[PDB]
Write a protein that binds this ligand. Structure first.
Ligand SMILES: C[C@@H]1CC[C@@]2(OC1)O[C@H]1[C@@H](O)[C@H]3[C@@H]4CC[C@H]5C[C@@H](O[C@@H]6O[C@H](CO)[C@H](O[C@@H]7O[C@H](CO)[C@@H](O)[C@H](O[C@@H]8OC[C@@H](O)[C@H](O)[C@H]8O)[C@H]7O[C@@H]7O[C@H](CO)[C@H](O)[C@H](O[C@@H]8O[C@H](CO)[C@@H](O)[C@H](O)[C@H]8O)[C@H]7O)[C@H](O)[C@H]6O)[C@H](O)C[C@]5(C)[C@H]4CC[C@]3(C)[C@H]1[C@@H]2C
Ligand SMILES: C[C@@H]1CC[C@@]2(OC1)O[C@H]1[C@@H](O)[C@H]3[C@@H]4CC[C@H]5C[C@@H](O[C@@H]6O[C@H](CO)[C@H](O[C@@H]7O[C@H](CO)[C@@H](O)[C@H](O[C@@H]8OC[C@@H](O)[C@H](O)[C@H]8O)[C@H]7O[C@@H]7O[C@H](CO)[C@H](O)[C@H](O[C@@H]8O[C@H](CO)[C@@H](O)[C@H](O)[C@H]8O)[C@H]7O)[C@H](O)[C@H]6O)[C@H](O)C[C@]5(C)[C@H]4CC[C@]3(C)[C@H]1[C@@H]2C
Ligand SMILES: C[C@@H]1CC[C@@]2(OC1)O[C@H]1[C@@H](O)[C@H]3[C@@H]4CC[C@H]5C[C@@H](O[C@@H]6O[C@H](CO)[C@H](O[C@@H]7O[C@H](CO)[C@@H](O)[C@H](O[C@@H]8OC[C@@H](O)[C@H](O)[C@H]8O)[C@H]7O[C@@H]7O[C@H](CO)[C@H](O)[C@H](O[C@@H]8O[C@H](CO)[C@@H](O)[C@H](O)[C@H]8O)[C@H]7O)[C@H](O)[C@H]6O)[C@H](O)C[C@]5(C)[C@H]4CC[C@]3(C)[C@H]1[C@@H]2C
Ligand SMILES: C[C@@H]1CC[C@@]2(OC1)O[C@H]1[C@@H](O)[C@H]3[C@@H]4CC[C@H]5C[C@@H](O[C@@H]6O[C@H](CO)[C@H](O[C@@H]7O[C@H](CO)[C@@H](O)[C@H](O[C@@H]8OC[C@@H](O)[C@H](O)[C@H]8O)[C@H]7O[C@@H]7O[C@H](CO)[C@H](O)[C@H](O[C@@H]8O[C@H](CO)[C@@H](O)[C@H](O)[C@H]8O)[C@H]7O)[C@H](O)[C@H]6O)[C@H](O)C[C@]5(C)[C@H]4CC[C@]3(C)[C@H]1[C@@H]2C
Ligand SMILES: CCCCCCCC/C=C\CCCCCCCC(=O)O[C@@H](COC(=O)CCCCCCCCCCCCCCC)COP(=O)([O-])OCC[N+](C)(C)C
Ligand SMILES: CCCCCCCC/C=C\CCCCCCCC(=O)O[C@@H](COC(=O)CCCCCCCCCCCCCCC)COP(=O)([O-])OCC[N+](C)(C)C
Ligand SMILES: CCCCCCCC/C=C\CCCCCCCC(=O)O[C@@H](COC(=O)CCCCCCCCCCCCCCC)COP(=O)([O-])OCC[N+](C)(C)C
Ligand SMILES: CCCCCCCC/C=C\CCCCCCCC(=O)O[C@@H](COC(=O)CCCCCCCCCCCCCCC)COP(=O)([O-])OCC[N+](C)(C)C
Ligand SMILES: CC(C)CCC[C@@H](C)[C@H]1CC[C@H]2[C@@H]3CC=C4C[C@@H](O)CC[C@]4(C)[C@H]3CC[C@]12C
Ligand SMILES: CC(C)CCC[C@@H](C)[C@H]1CC[C@H]2[C@@H]3CC=C4C[C@@H](O)CC[C@]4(C)[C@H]3CC[C@]12C
Ligand SMILES: [K+]
Ligand SMILES: [K+]
Ligand SMILES: [K+]
Ligand SMILES: [K+]
Ligand SMILES: [K+]
Lengths: 615, 355, 237
């Protein structure tokens, strides 16, 4: 409730005349009562059960704008909680079938039950937010390009802007946090033009970053296309997704007309006056392999030492034979997307208890390169056997989602694991340069992961160095997403199609039917379905933009990349000690989301980009 | 509301006059001011009436009935050129909405303060209107005895009488002599006792549950303090205090401040009371930086972390203590820490903290 | 608390005395009432106890106004200080204290698993109407407070049965029940336990404690398992 109210009732949020009514059959404690009293002018509480129609009539559910169902993330059995939430959805839709429902789902396979309810209309705004799927997809996309989770979390969360006058990194960083995500209908002047041309026009003239469009067809349903190539042409009445600082400026994309706005360059002056072997799965959007037993992937410490792993992913898991499953497939599916070549796939090594991993291997044995090292993440010997100093990313996850006497203590394992890896020493020289992502139950613990920081203890979550650098993932940001889903239902769809790797509803239905990923022979239709866009990072040290990265402007890089390689640059991952004159050994980098046209570049920068697929 | 206050002041001034007297409307402008106030109230009543969804329930509203008993008397008074005291004291009931006014003026924000102001306003309003009833009845006299039972009581003497009665003191220096006055005093005693009995739970809620181990440590100059946290129970604290505060120990000006998020039981409370001159306790968590600021950890000489020797999983306790060390060193890296560790292999984690 | 109460009483009495003897200032001080200071102290005490004799009272306007405010403030302060009054009253101990040794009256100390059924059976056989007159009192020692049924059973035999809260393993509690002069110690066992061996070890340790305090006392104990009683031969006493 604290997280949801913090994001929903933000001071910088535009004036909305919406009240919040909580319905729950457990009486609140002292802290909840104090929190309700703090927001007594906008928040009401009532004691009752959703499954009782009398209580539904009490809170006037027949006239509510929406119903939001929160889930118990800390339960012994996730499936029981999912079934309870689905039954609550059934009860609410039985009372009033036309109400909009946004629910939280723990496990990914349980959301198919929501398609069994006849009143559940996804096209009318009913949504399910899968915590495990979204969280592990965020982590996987950050494995492909670090800091993307921070960018996305800042992109759909309300953040108060603070003016910084001193020359620090928080200034450049706080510039981007202002950005938000909007949807708008493209003007009639943009029809018949390719996507890169419209994107360049929006960036240069209207100062809007257009990320994706919603393509409609007669054969299939509407599908979100992320940075389509120049072969595609804009149709009539196509929705587009923009990243912009102000909501009012988005309307320029709808009121644009070449007759009396092409001559003027200033966006402020724009007005409304118009004038034989199975290599991929059945749908062909994921890499597939023949099923193999768990005995063929288990490596001993000596066996893992004999092989050499470089540029791989190390997933450390604090599992248990009785702990709740976390659904590791949602982490491996984005990393095995068909838009990656086979040689570009990153080896995944799971370090953890084999008793826990045997329960998860049933959904993981169809993926090409997955290895298991039975042991513990807290042992330096196992981490040295797996070549932790040469990995592309280390992901520390805690399966023990059970309730603890102190809420903060739930993060006691992972933090120590992080502090172990940063303290190791290697010779051909230290573990501080190893890229690590750590999930965190409590936000207040985010500053425990970093020591080379001057943050005062009352610093908010989004301003800490671990969050700004993308080295820490806080699950509480998902609690904000629901609020962002209420004011705009396309945000969740765009996030899912950008993060999960392109899970089409047909694949959803197939997985619901069989609870497995089925292989299939390659056909030209599937190979055409393979062509998508992927998230990547580029360095300006020796690329084609090396000369432009030496003091050039960001807009020139954006225009050149989009015109030449159909590449969509949407952020700078910048070395933290880059504005200082004195040299530094720090390799930490922070995230700058959508810099302006006149933003200056330095050669020690990384560029977030959307690569096209080529053969 | 301001005009209601003004009309109440007008009634207070007019109560010092004979209860029924002839007067000229044009000779005194106080009656003109009262007439203007009453016609404004009538206009507001009509404005409420023309925009009421339910006629019956609006007709029984307390504002409607208090306006029903005020303006027809002043109409009859201006028509007859003679004024009777009437039921003007009922205007005091308009003070009940006072809290709402303050809210519109954004003077009150918290819910508890609003409820307190509402309770005070309702108490004052019912006190004043009961005093007005008693004053009118006592000065008027009994009607069936040709008004020969009049008692010369001022309004404020009746306020004093109501206050003395409702506190169950009853001096007897002033009391109601008429039959109607005594009947109304009996009914007022019954109603006041019933209302107090009904409002007792709100009084208890406003008193609330006082915090016992809140607040912050006060830094005495020239007096070092040691912050003790971890597993705080009877046995560990007893042993540590027995060795630390020894009679044969040389005079050391060191205070001990315990920080723990479980409230102490009777034995710990007695032990703390025995050493109340040197030992303080506070309720909080080490992992919360606000609680660390409460006990002045930035000026403590040392932090001592005790361990739960009697636990199902020693490794979990060791990890919790290491995380407490991490939190303390994150708040203030220069503080000295002495911790208890259960298992030997877990202390290597302490070398992973650069502080 | 006593000092603050006395100080506010005295200062309120003095203020009332000043106001009453001075008289109303706007009436040329013609309302003076000849009240001594101690009469005003008496008036304040009679008022604040809500007695109100009316023999002495404030006649001036300021006196009555300040008496009204004093009544309000006194009631408010009393309501605020009620929790401290309750805390100072505190929770009175019910089964504390020490047994009093009556001369010429032997006593038996009973400990172990003390519940309704075992105590009921033991008292039913021990305190029999047909039993010959024996001047023996029974003192139970147990660190769990009795429930309603046990309290009723103890009240039924209040002339011969005493109960005390304590532990046998604590020598102070042993000194409380005068174990050094008891005729015998009887240890009852929990016949319904998950682990009989743990109960037997606990009873043997109780025997060790009692024989450590006073080696010459007679002990009759209940043992669950047969092999556990050999431990009783390891005690030298
Ligand atoms: C704006 C908001 C709303 C509420 C509020 O402010 C915030 O409104 C304010 C405003 O509205 C105020 C009122 C305005 C009108 C005031 C009138 C005033 O009475 C006047 O007092 C004068 C005093 O010199 C005269 O009285 C005469 O005084 C002579 C001696 O000097 C006597 O002799 C003679 O008798 C008196 O005459 C009096 O009046 C008649 C003469 O015309 C008769 O002789 C009558 O007998 C006698 O008594 C005069 O004649 C009389 O009128 C009264 O004392 C207070 C009064 C009512 C005020 C009380 C407080 C208010 C309500 C204020 C209130 C806070
Ligand atoms: C909410 C605040 C506090 C209360 C108050 O202000 C508003 O109310 C005002 C108002 O009520 C005033 C009274 C109005 C009536 C006045 C009457 C006047 O005349 C005398 O009145 C006596 C009776 O009271 C005699 O009879 C005789 O008629 C005459 O000798 C007297 O001299 C002062 C008087 C009593 C006033 C004293 C001062 C007040 C109480 C004012 C007082 C500050
Ligand atoms: C005219 C005279 C005036 C004086 C007097 O007589 C008339 O007034 C009477 C009246 O005012 C009485 C009071 C009325 C209100 C009473 C309230 C009562 O507390 C009740 O106790 C319940 C016990 O179950 C509730 O407790 C809840 O219980 C839940 C579990 O069931 C928990 O949650 C949590 O505990 C609580 O929630 C809750 O705590 C509360 O409902 C308290 O125990 C006694 C009480 C204060 C009374 C004490 C005696 C009085 C003062 C009487 C007094 C003689
Ligand atoms: C001018 C007149 C005088 C007389 C009077 O009116 C005004 O004074 C009023 C005022 O003085 C009242 C008292 C105020 C103080 C009150 C205290 C209240 O006890 C509260 O009860 C709570 C219940 O949860 C707390 O209990 C804690 O609860 C924890 C768990 O939540 C546990 O720990 C443990 O139990 C406690 O710790 C704690 O026990 C205490 O906070 C009690 O139940 C009634 C109480 C005594 C009241 C009784 C009625 C009164 C006397 C009123 C009375 C009519
Ligand atoms: C210095 C002080 C001066 C006092 C002077 C005498 C004034 C009293 C004389 C008169 C007032 C009588 C009516 C009281 C109000 C009834 C309606 C109401 O709000 O009820 C409230 C309580 O009240 C009850 O619970 C009902 C009490 C009815 C008493 C009737 C007695 C008749 C003889 C509701 O309480 P709640 O918390 O909403 O529940
Ligand atoms: C025989 C006896 C003679 C008595 C004569 C009349 C004396 C009374 C006259 C006057 C004293 C009035 C002020 C009381 C003290 C306020 C400050 C204070 O210490 O508050 C205390 C209580 O007090 C409160 O909680 C506030 C009570 C305010 C009452 C105001 C009434 C005004 C009319 C704080 O209490 P705590 O436990 O720290 O919490
Ligand atoms: C112990 C110290 C307390 C008190 C010491 C004694 C002080 C008063 C005695 C001397 C004054 C006296 O009697 O003179 C005259 C005044 O008479 C009174 O004052 C009588 C009323 C006394 C009230 C009770 C005393 C204070 C209560 C307890 C206060 C505790 C604090 C005689 O009056 P008369 O002849 O009747 O006319
Ligand atoms: C603060 C505003 C309160 C009050 C402001 C003051 C109003 C009264 C003062 C003027 C009236 C006055 O004294 O005239 C005569 C009447 O005498 C009395 O009325 C004396 C009794 C007053 C009781 C206490 C006042 C109300 C209590 C508290 C009410 C709180 C609400 C003089 O009488 P005499 O000469 O003795 O014959
Ligand atoms: C809810 C309330 C307003 C209704 C109660 C009725 C009240 C206001 C009525 C009913 C009986 C009335 C009394 C009846 C007789 C007389 C005698 C005369 O000298 C006028 C006043 C006086 C003393 C009246 C005062 C007002 C009175 C008390
Ligand atoms: C916190 C306290 C000290 C402040 C309260 C003010 C008190 C002390 C003042 C304010 C008004 C004063 C009164 C005003 C007028 C007179 C008349 C004269 O014969 C002197 C005494 C007497 C009766 C005063 C006594 C003291 C008094 C009541
Ligand atoms: K934002
Ligand atoms: K009395
Ligand atoms: K009396
Ligand atoms: K009384
Ligand atoms: K009395």
């Amino acid at each position: 409730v604290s997280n949801f109210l913090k994001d929903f009732l933000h001071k910088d949020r535009d004036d909305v005349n919406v009240e919040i009514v909580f319905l729950h059959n457990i009486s609140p404690n002292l802290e909840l009562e104090a929190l309700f009293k703090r927001h007594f002018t906008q928040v009401e509480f009532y004691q009752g059960s959703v499954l009782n129609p009398h209580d539904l009539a009490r809170v006037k559910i027949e006239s509510a704008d929406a119903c939001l169902i929160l889930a118990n993330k800390y339960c012994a059995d996730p499936d029981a909680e999912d079934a309870s939430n689905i039954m609550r959805v059934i009860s609410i839709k039985n009372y009033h079938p036309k109400i909009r429902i946004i629910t939280q789902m723990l496990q990914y396979h349980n959301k198919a039950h929501l398609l069994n309810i006849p009143s559940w209309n996804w096209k009318e705004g009913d949504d399910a937010i899968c915590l495990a799927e979204l969280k592990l997809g965020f982590i996987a996309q950050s494995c492909l390009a670090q800091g993307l989770s921070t960018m996305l979390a800042n992109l759909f969360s309300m953040r108060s802007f603070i003016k910084i006058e001193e020359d620090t990194w928080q200034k450049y960083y706080l510039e981007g946090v202002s950005n938000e995500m909007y949807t708008e209908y493209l003007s009639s002047a943009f029809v018949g033009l390719s996507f890169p041309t419209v994107c360049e026009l929006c960036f240069v003239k209207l100062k809007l970053l257009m990320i994706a469009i919603e393509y409609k067809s007669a054969n299939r349903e509407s599908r979100i296309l992320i940075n389509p190539g120049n072969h595609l042409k804009i149709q009539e009445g196509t929705l587009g997704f923009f990243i912009a600082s102000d909501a009012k400026e988005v309307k320029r994309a709808f009121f644009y007309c070449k007759a009396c706005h092409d001559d003027i360059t200033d966006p402020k002056r724009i007005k409304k006056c118009g004038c034989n072997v199975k290599k991929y799965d059945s749908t062909g959007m994921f890499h597939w392999c023949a099923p193999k037993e768990i005995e063929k992937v288990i490596l001993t410490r000596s066996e893992a030492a004999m092989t050499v792993l470089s540029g791989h992913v190390v997933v450390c898991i604090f599992g248990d034979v009785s702990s709740a499953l976390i659904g590791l497939r949602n982490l491996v599916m984005p990393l095995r997307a068909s838009n990656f070549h086979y040689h570009e796939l990153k080896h995944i090594v799971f370090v953890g208890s084999i008793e826990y991993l045997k329960r998860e291997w049933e959904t993981l044995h169809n993926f090409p390169k997955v290895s298991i090292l039975p042991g513990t993440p807290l042992s330096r010997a196992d981490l040295r056997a797996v070549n932790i100093n040469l990995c592309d990313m280390c992901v520390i996850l805690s399966a023990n989602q059970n309730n603890i006497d102190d809420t903060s203590l739930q993060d006691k394992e992972c933090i120590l694991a992080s502090l172990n890896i940063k303290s190791m020493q290697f010779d051909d020289t230290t573990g501080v340069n190893i890229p690590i992502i750590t999930e965190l139950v409590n936000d207040t613990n985010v500053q425990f992961l970093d020591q080379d920081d001057d943050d005062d203890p009352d610093t908010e979550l989004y301003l800490t160095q671990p969050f700004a650098c993308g080295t820490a993932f806080a699950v509480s940001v998902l609690d904000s997403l629901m609020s962002a889903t209420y004011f705009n239902d396309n945000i969740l769809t765009l996030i899912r199609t950008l993060v999960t790797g392109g899970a089409t509803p047909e694949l959803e239905a197939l997985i619901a039917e069989e609870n497995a990923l089925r292989g299939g022979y390659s056909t030209p239709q599937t190979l055409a379905n393979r062509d998508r866009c992927r998230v990547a990072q580029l360095a300006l040290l020796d690329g084609p933009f090396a000369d432009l990265g030496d003091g050039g402007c960001y807009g020139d890089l954006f225009c050149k990349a989009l015109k030449t390689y159909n590449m969509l640059c949407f952020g700078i991952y910048r070395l933290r000690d880059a504005h200082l004159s004195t040299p530094s050994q720090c390799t930490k980098r922070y995230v700058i989301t959508n810099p302006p046209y006149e933003f200056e570049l330095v050669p020690t920068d990384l560029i977030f980009c959307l690569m096209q697929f080529d053969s | 509301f301001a005009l209601s206050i003004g009309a109440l002041v007008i009634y207070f001034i007019d109560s010092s006059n004979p209860i029924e007297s002839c007067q000229n409307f044009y000779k005194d402008f106080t009656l003109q001011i009262d007439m203007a106030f009453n016609v404004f109230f009538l206009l507001y009543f009509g404005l409420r009436f023309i925009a009421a969804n339910d006629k019956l329930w609006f007709w029984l509203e307390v504002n409607s009935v208090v306006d029903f008993f005020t303006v027809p008397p002043v109409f009859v008074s201006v028509y007859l050129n003679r004024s009777w005291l009437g039921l003007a004291f009922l205007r005091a009931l308009r003070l009940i909405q006072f809290s709402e006014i303050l809210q519109f003026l954004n003077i009150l924000k918290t819910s508890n303060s609003i409820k307190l102001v509402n309770l005070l306003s309702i108490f004052i309003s019912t006190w004043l209107t009961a005093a007005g009833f008693i004053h009118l009845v006592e000065n008027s006299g009994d009607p069936w005895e040709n008004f020969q039972n009049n008692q010369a009581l001022t309004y404020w003497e009746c306020v004093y009488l109501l206050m003395v009665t409702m506190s169950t003191v009853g001096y007897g220096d002033v009391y109601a002599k008429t039959t109607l006055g005594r009947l109304f005093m009996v009914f007022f005693i019954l109603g006041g006792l019933a209302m107090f009995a009904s409002y007792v739970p709100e009084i208890i809620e406003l008193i609330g549950n006082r915090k016992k181990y809140g607040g912050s440590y006060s830094a005495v100059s020239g007096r070092k303090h040691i912050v003790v946290c971890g597993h705080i129970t009877l046995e560990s604290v007893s042993n540590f205090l027995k060795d630390f505060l020894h009679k044969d120990r040389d005079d050391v000006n060191v205070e001990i401040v315990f920080l723990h998020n479980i409230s102490p039981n009777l034995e710990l409370e007695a032990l703390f009371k025995r050493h109340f001159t040197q030992v303080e306790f506070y309720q909080g968590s080490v992992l919360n930086p606000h609680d660390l600021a409460r006990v002045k950890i930035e000026s403590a000489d040392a932090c001592l972390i005790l361990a739960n020797k009697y636990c199902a999983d020693p490794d979990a306790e060791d990890a919790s203590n290491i995380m407490r060390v991490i939190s303390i060193k994150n708040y203030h890296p220069k503080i000295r820490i002495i911790t208890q560790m259960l298992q030997y292999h877990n202390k290597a984690h302490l070398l992973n903290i650069p502080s």
